[PDB]
A paper describes a structure:
The crystal structure of [name] in complex with lactose was determined in the orthorhombic space group P212121 with unit cell parameters a = 38.1 Å, b = 79.7 Å, and c = 106.0 Å. Two polypeptide chains were found to be present in the asymmetric unit, and a total of 164 amino acid residues per polypeptide chain were observed. There are two disulfide bonds at Cys3 and Cys122 between the two chains in the asymmetric unit. Therefore, the dimer structure, formed due to the formation of the disulfide bonds, was supposed to be a functional dimer in solution. The dimer structure forms a helical-bar like shape, where lactose binding sites are located on both of its termini. The protomer structure of [name] was composed of a core structure with seven β-sheets and three surrounding helices and loops. The seven β-sheets formed small jelly-roll type β-sandwich folds. A lactose molecule in the site was bound to a Ca2+ ion, where its glucose residue was quite solvent exposed whilst its galactose residue was mainly buried in the binding site groove. β-galactose residue in lactose is held by two coordinate bonds with Ca2+ ion and two hydrogen bonds with side chain nitrogen atoms of Arg64; hydroxyl groups at positions 2, 3, and 4, and oxygen at position 5 in the β-galactose residue form hydrogen and coordinating bonds in the site. The binding of β-galactose residues was further stabilized by hydrophobic interactions between the hydrophobic face of the β-galactose residue in the lactose and side chains of Phe67, Tyr97, and Phe103. In addition, the Ca2+ ion coordinately bound sidechain oxygen atoms of Glu141, Asp150, and Asn151, and main chain oxygen atoms of Met147 and Cys48, present in these sites.
[name] was purified from [name] and identified as a Ca2+-dependent and galactose-specific lectin (18.5 kDa) forming a disulfide-bonded dimer. Hemagglutination inhibition assay, ITC analysis, and glycoconjugate microarray revealed its strict specificity for β-linked terminal galactose, but not for GalNAc. The primary structure of [name] was not homologous with that of any known lectins. Accordingly, [name] was assumed to be a novel type of lectin with a unique structure and specificity.
Residue numbers in the entry:
A (entry chain A), B (entry chain B): 1 to 164
Write the structure that this text describes.
Amino acid sequence: QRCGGWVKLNTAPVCFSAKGNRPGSFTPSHHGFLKSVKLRHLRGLVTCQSSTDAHDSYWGCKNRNGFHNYPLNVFVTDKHNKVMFPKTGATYYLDPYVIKNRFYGVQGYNAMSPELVLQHGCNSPSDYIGPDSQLRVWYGEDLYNTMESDNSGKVCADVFGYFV
Amino acid sequence: QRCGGWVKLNTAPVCFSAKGNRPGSFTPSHHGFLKSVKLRHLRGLVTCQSSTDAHDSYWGCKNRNGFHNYPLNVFVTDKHNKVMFPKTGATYYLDPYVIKNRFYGVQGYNAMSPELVLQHGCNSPSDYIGPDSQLRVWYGEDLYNTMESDNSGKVCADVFGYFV
Ligand SMILES: OC[C@H]1O[C@@H](O[C@H]2[C@H](O)[C@@H](O)[C@H](O)O[C@@H]2CO)[C@H](O)[C@@H](O)[C@H]1O
Ligand SMILES: OC[C@H]1O[C@@H](O[C@H]2[C@H](O)[C@@H](O)[C@H](O)O[C@@H]2CO)[C@H](O)[C@@H](O)[C@H]1O
Ligand SMILES: [Ca+2]
Ligand SMILES: [Ca+2]
Ligand SMILES: [Ca+2]
Ligand SMILES: [Ca+2]
């Protein structure tokens, strides 16, 4: 029902944990093709290493190890856990120890950004958001089952979209 | 860029006449969903009343009768002659004598604009431009079979798209 945006897609807060296959899953209120989403932090912190508070963040694992420049670790998928955001604008940390974990950065944002904008890139037919779609906000280490056991926290957010 | 810049959709110039069911037809070189197209005049002129060269234009019928301010009459359709551009941003001339002819204006452009940008509005599934698609650049009086017999000319253009 909406062209452009931002338009709020969620009803209730969308809340994700950092382990245990616990994404924040919801049925979007509006249909169409999305250019991007904007995640607006409401409450909570997650971390990829619970032995310290140093990495606690909205969207990832801040100031961690050797990759302070790849602090993000949130992915918005469809109901099949296929990533829809980000698909552009993100650079990934590629060291083999944690390549599969998919830590990333987006220039202009960090893991403490009050609002995080993630780009879809251009659309293909199967990217349509319809009545049957579900979006899932995942922590990457949870999604990929990489080193999740030492994670903790829970973040709640609103999710806005921009339709094209 | 392929996703984000003007992308040339045609190869050879796209040439349309103003009568005789003679749109300029082509299969786009790139697939996906468009926000807009840009038509770039290359050569030729068309008119909606051939008794003089007064109205000869790139995109319509310039300085004609009652509708100097609605001089445009080009439409980009799919292979079933369904209009895809413009679908927003166009103001139609509604005088009963020529309402069906679908003369229109777009702010900041006229029928001699070297380039004309036409907006699609937001996309639905059936707006996909794929390998089976054919885009057609029509003269409106020819598309709608309204007062076409006194038309003449042929315009050739390049056609660019903005993918989303
Ligand atoms: O290197 C970044 C990586 O650290 C993981 O934690 C390691 C921890 O540092 C190490 O002492 C322990 O032996 O193994 C842990 C992994 O099982 C974090 O879990 C991971 O999220 C990354 O941040
Ligand atoms: O009124 C705009 C309309 O004019 C049509 O031409 C008229 C013409 O002016 C009239 O003298 C003739 O006898 O009837 C024509 C229509 O069949 C143009 O063809 C049309 O394109 C409009 O520009
Ligand atoms: Ca971890
Ligand atoms: Ca998991
Ligand atoms: Ca005519
Ligand atoms: Ca015709």
